[PDB]
Design a protein around this nucleic acid. Structure first.
Ligand SMILES: Nc1ncnc2c1ncn2[C@H]1CC[C@@H](COP(=O)(O)OP(=O)(O)OP(=O)(O)O)O1
Ligand SMILES: [Mg+2]
Lengths: 658, 105
DNA sequence: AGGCACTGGC
DNA sequence: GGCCAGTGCCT
C-alpha cells in the first residue's frame, strides 16, 4: 500500500500542469518527494504498486488526483496512464461512509459558518488546509511589493507548495488509519495497511467495496456529462423573460406603487416629552434661502414599485384588499405560499384576478432562475463540450442516497410541471452528435419499479411470510391498502401509503387522519409488526442509535418515529447504488465500452432511475435489458424476499424517457 | 377650512387654482408630518383670502406625489400657477412657515 | 421524508 | 458579500 497526493495548476476541468507529488510507501516507511521533473517518475512509482497488486490511497483521488493524472499523463508526457479502480482507496469516500452523521465543507467549496453541527478534525484540517497555503504565499509576497494576483498561488510550483504537499499526505495517512481502525468496517484481525487490493476488498465490510465502486463510477458519469441543449433553453429563457415582462406590467398596473419610510437616523421625540417613540418611523433632523430643510424633523421615504416576487408586497396589497390571513409564521408573518394564495378571496374582481397572475408570476421565476438567471443556472453551467457536468456526491445523505449539486440535476422540473416538458427535453443523448458518424446518440432511461413499497414487503415478510411481497407482484397491492385503511378511492390509498397532512389528504384534518393510521395499521399487522420489532432494537434511552444497512454499513437514525422510513429509504438506496454498479459492470463484461468515444455513457442517476446514453438504438436496448438482470442480481445477492424489477424506455431526451 | 385633495382632484383643484396653494404631501405614519399638521391648519386661517392650504395624503393617493420627486415628508410645495413655486421638506415652525411663506407670498 | 437552491430583505 | 427566512423542485 501507499498514500500519495498531487498538486496541480488547476481544478480538473482546467488542469494542465503537474506541480509535484509526495508519497509514503508503507513497506518502506518513507516519503519520496517527486518534483515537476520527477512527474514521469511519480507516475512510475504508482504504476509500480499496481504491478505488485498493491493499493494506492488518495484523499478524494477518485474524483481528482486519479483522473487528473490520466489527463496530465497524456498532456505533459504523451503517456497513457490508467490506475485501475481495484487498487485505489479514497479517504474521502471512506470518511463519508464512517462519519455519516457529521458534515463536510466539500473540500473548501462552502462556508462552514452556515453549516450546522460539528466539523470533523482532519476534514476541516484538509479542506481549509488549502487556504493555509494561500495566505502563506500571499503574505510571503504581499509584502514584497508584488500585489497578489487573483489566484497566482497555483500558477507555478515552488517549495512552499512542495511542503504543503508532503503535509497533505501525512494528514491523509493519519486519516486513513483512524478509519481503518473502525472495527465495524475493518476487522482488527487483519492489517489492511499490509494487504493486497483483493484482500482489502473482500476481507472488509461490503460497504467499503460498494461505495468505492460507486464513487468511481459516478465520478465517470460526472466527467461524461449530460448533453444539454443550450439553444432550446436559451429559447425558453426568452419566452419566459417575456411572459414575465407582461405579468409584471399587467400587475404593476393593478397594484400601484407606494411610499415606505426608509433612511431615518434619529428617533421621533415627543413634541413636549422627548421619549424615543420606536413604533414611529425613524426621521432625520438636520442648516436652514432655497433651503431644502430647517432646524424641523422629517421622515425620509422611498418610492417602491409592486414586486410580484416580494412575498411581502403580495401580503400587503392583498391584505388591503380585505384578506384575513389565517396561517402565519413563527416569526410574526402570514404564509403566502401558492397554497394560501389559491385560497385567498378578496372582493375587487380585477384584484382577485391578479392573484392567479402572481401565482403564475412566482412560478415563471422559479424557472427563469433554475435555467437562466440563478447562480447555479443551467445556462451558466454548460461546458464548452455542450454538456452540463453537475457534481454528484455518492453519499452525503445519511441513508445512502447521493446528493446532487452544481447545478443540481435531481430537481429538474418533471414533465408534469409548467415548462417541465421543455426543460427535460433539453437534457438528452440526442444532443450529442457522435464523434465519428457525427450522428445523434439515443438515450435509455431505466428506473426501478416500486422499489419503495417493495423494501417494505421484503422487510415485513419475516412477519407476512410473503403476503405483501406476493400481493405487490402476482396480484394487486393498492386495493389491499385501499381496503387496509377504511378508504374510499384507490388513488387515495396510493397517496396514503407512499406518504407515511393525512386526514386532510382524505377530507378532514385530524381525527379521521389519526384514525386511518389505526384501521390501516390494524388490518395490516405486518407493518405494525415491523414497526414494533425496530423500536425493540434501538429503544430501551438508546441502545443502538443506528441501524444496519443491506450491505452492512451503519445507518444512523435521527428519531424513533423516523426509524422505519430510514430503514426503508436506505434499503432502496443501496439497492440502486449496487444496481447501477452491476449494470455498468455487466455492460462491460458483455463487450461495450463506457465513455463518449465508446458505445454507452452514464449521464445521470436520480435515486431510483438512470439515464444512460447509447451510441445506437441496438446498444440502447441491451442496456435496458442489462439493467434488468443487474437488478434481479442485486436481488438474489441480498436475499431479497420480493422480486425487484425495472422498466426500460428508449428515446432522444430525458423528457421522452419518462 | 383646509382643502383635502385626491389623486383625481389634484389637477383642477391645485393646478388650475390660479391662486396660491401650499400643497402638503403627507402620511399618518410620519411623525413630523403630524407635527407640521396643526401649524398648517392655523396657517390656513391666518392667511384666508391670500393663501389656500391643501393637504394630500400619499398613502391614499399614491399617484400624485411621484411626479415631484417626493423623497421626503412633509414635503411642502407652494403652487403658483401650474408649476411649483417653492419646495421645503420638514416641520417648519408656526413662525418659520409664516417666514417661508411671506417671502414668497 | 431526503436533498439543493432561488429571491427578497437587512 | 455573507446570512436567515420563506418556499418550491425533485425522487
Ligand atoms: N407521494 C409519493 N411520494 C413518492 N413516491 C410516490 C408517491 N406517489 C406515488 N409514488 C411513486 C410510486 C411509484 C411511482 C409511480 O406511481 P404509479 O402510480 O404510476 O405506480 P403504482 O405502482 O402506484 O400503480 P400502477 O403502476 O398500477 O399505475 O411513484
Ligand atoms: Mg488533494
Amino acid at each position: 500500500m501507499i498514500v500519495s497526493d498531487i498538486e496541480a495548476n488547476a481544478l480538473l476541468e482546467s488542469v494542465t500542469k503537474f506541480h509535484c507529488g509526495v508519497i509514503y510507501d508503507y513497506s518502506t516507511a518513507e516519503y519520496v518527494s517527486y518534483r515537476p521533473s520527477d512527474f514521469g517518475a511519480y507516475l512510475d512509482a504508482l504504476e509500480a504498486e499496481v504491478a505488485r497488486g498493491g493499493l494506492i490511497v488518495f484523499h478524494n483521488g477518485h474524483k481528482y488526483d486519479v483522473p487528473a493524472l490520466t489527463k496530465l499523463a497524456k498532456l505533459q508526457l504523451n503517456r497513457e496512464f490508467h490506475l485501475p479502480r481495484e487498487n485505489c482507496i479514497d479517504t474521502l469516500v471512506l470518511s463519508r461512509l464512517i462519519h455519516s452523521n457529521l458534515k463536510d465543507t466539500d473540500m473548501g467549496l462552502l462556508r462552514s459558518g452556515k453549516l450546522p453541527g460539528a466539523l470533523e478534525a482532519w476534514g476541516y484540517r484538509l479542506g481549509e488546509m488549502k487556504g493555509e497555503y494561500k495566505d502563506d504565499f500571499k503574505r510571503m509576497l504581499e509584502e514584497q511589493g508584488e500585489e497578489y494576483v487573483d489566484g497566482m498561488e497555483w500558477w507555478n510550483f515552488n517549495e512552499e507548495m512542495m511542503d504543503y504537499n508532503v503535509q497533505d499526505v501525512v494528514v491523509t495517512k493519519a486519516l486513513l488509519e483512524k478509519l481503518l481502525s473502525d472495527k465495524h468496517y475493518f476487522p482488527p484481525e487483519i492489517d489492511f495497511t499490509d494487504v493486497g487490493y483483493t484482500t482489502f476488498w473482500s476481507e472488509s465490510l461490503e460497504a467499503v467495496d460498494i461505495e468505492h465502486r460507486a464513487a468511481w463510477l459516478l465520478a465517470k458519469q460526472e466527467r461524461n456529462g449530460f448533453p444539454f441543449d443550450t439553444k432550446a433553453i436559451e429559447e425558453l429563457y426568452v419566452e419566459l423573460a417575456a411572459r414575465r415582462s407582461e405579468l409584471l406590467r399587467k400587475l404593476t398596473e393593478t397594484f400601484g406603487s407606494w411610499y415606505q419610510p426608509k433612511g431615518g437616523t434619529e428617533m421621533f421625540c415627543h413634541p413636549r416629552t422627548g421619549k424615543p417613540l420606536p413604533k414611529y418611523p425613524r426621521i432625520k433632523t438636520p442648516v436652514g434661502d432655497t433651503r431644502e430643510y430647517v432646524a424641523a424633523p422629517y421622515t425620509p421615504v422611498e418610492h417602491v414599485v409592486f414586486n410580484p416576487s416580494s412575498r411581502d408586497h403580495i401580503q400587503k396589497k392583498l391584505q388591503e384588499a380585505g384578506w384575513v390571513p389565517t396561517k402565519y409564521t413563527d416569526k410574526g408573518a402570514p404564509v403566502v405560499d401558492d397554497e394560501v394564495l389559491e385560497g385567498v378571496r378578496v372582493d375587487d374582481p380585477e384584484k382577485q384576478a391578479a392573484i392567479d397572475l402572481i401565482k403564475e408570476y412566482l412560478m415563471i421565476q422559479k424557472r427563469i432562475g433554475q435555467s437562466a438567471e440563478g447562480d447555479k443556472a443551467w445556462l451558466r453551467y454548460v461546458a464548452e463540450d455542450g454538456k452540463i457536468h453537475g457534481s454528484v456526491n455518492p453519499n452525503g445523505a445519511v441513508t445512502g442516497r447521493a446528493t446532487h449539486a452544481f447545478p443540481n440535476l435531481a430537481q429538474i422540473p418533471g414533465v408534469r410541471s409548467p415548462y417541465g416538458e421543455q426543460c427535460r427535453a433539453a437534457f438528452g443523448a440526442e444532443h450529442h452528435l457522435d464523434g465519428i458518424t457525427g450522428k445523434p446518440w439515443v438515450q435509455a432511461g431505466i428506473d426501478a419499479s416500486g422499489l419503495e413499497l417493495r423494501c417494505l414487503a421484503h422487510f415485513m415478510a419475516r412477519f407476512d411470510n410473503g403476503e405483501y411481497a406476493h400481493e405487490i407482484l402476482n396480484g394487486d397491492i393498492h386495493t389491499k391498502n385501499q381496503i387496509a385503511a377504511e378508504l374510499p378511492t384507490r388513488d387515495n390509498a396510493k397517496t396514503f401509503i407512499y406518504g407515511f397532512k393525512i386526514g386532510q389528504i382524505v377530507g378532514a384534518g385530524k381525527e379521521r387522519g389519526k384514525e386511518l393510521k389505526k384501521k390501516f395499521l390494524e388490518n395490516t399487522p405486518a407493518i405494525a409488526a415491523l414497526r414494533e420489532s425496530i423500536q425493540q432494537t434501538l429503544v430501551e434511552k438508546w441502545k443502538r442509535r443506528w441501524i444496519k444497512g443491506l450491505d452492512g454499513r451503519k445507518v444512523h437514525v435521527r428519531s424513533p418515529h423516523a426509524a422505519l422510513n430510514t430503514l426503508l429509504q436506505s434499503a432502496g438506496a443501496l439497492i440502486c447504488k449496487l444496481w447501477i454498479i452491476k449494470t455498468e459492470e455487466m455492460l462491460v463484461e458483455k463487450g461495450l465500452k463506457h465513455g463518449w468515444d465508446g458505445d454507452f455513457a452514464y449521464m445521470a442517476w436520480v435515486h431510483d432511475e438512470i439515464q444512460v446514453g447509447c451510441r445506437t438504438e441496438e446498444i440502447a436496448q441491451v442496456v435496458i435489458e442489462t439493467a434488468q438482470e443487474a437488478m434481479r442480481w442485486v436481488g438474489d445477492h441480498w436475499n431479497f424476499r420480493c422480486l425487484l424489477d425495472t422498466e426500460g424506455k428508449m428515446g432522444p431526451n430525458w423528457a421522452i424517457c419518462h | 377650512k383646509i382643502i383635502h385633495l385626491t389623486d383625481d382632484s389634484f389637477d383642477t383643484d391645485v393646478l388650475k387654482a390660479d391662486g396660491a396653494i401650499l400643497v402638503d404631501f403627507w402620511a399618518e405614519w410620519c411623525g413630523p408630518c403630524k407635527m407640521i399638521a396643526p401649524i398648517l391648519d392655523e396657517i390656513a386661517d391666518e392667511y384666508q383670502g391670500k393663501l389656500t392650504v391643501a393637504k394630500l395624503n400619499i398613502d391614499q393617493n399614491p399617484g400624485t406625489a411621484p411626479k415631484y420627486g417626493i423623497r421626503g415628508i412633509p414635503t411642502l410645495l407652494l403652487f403658483k400657477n401650474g408649476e411649483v413655486a417653492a419646495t421645503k421638506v420638514g416641520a417648519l415652525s408656526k413662525g418659520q412657515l409664516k417666514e417661508f411663506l411671506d417671502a414668497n407670498l
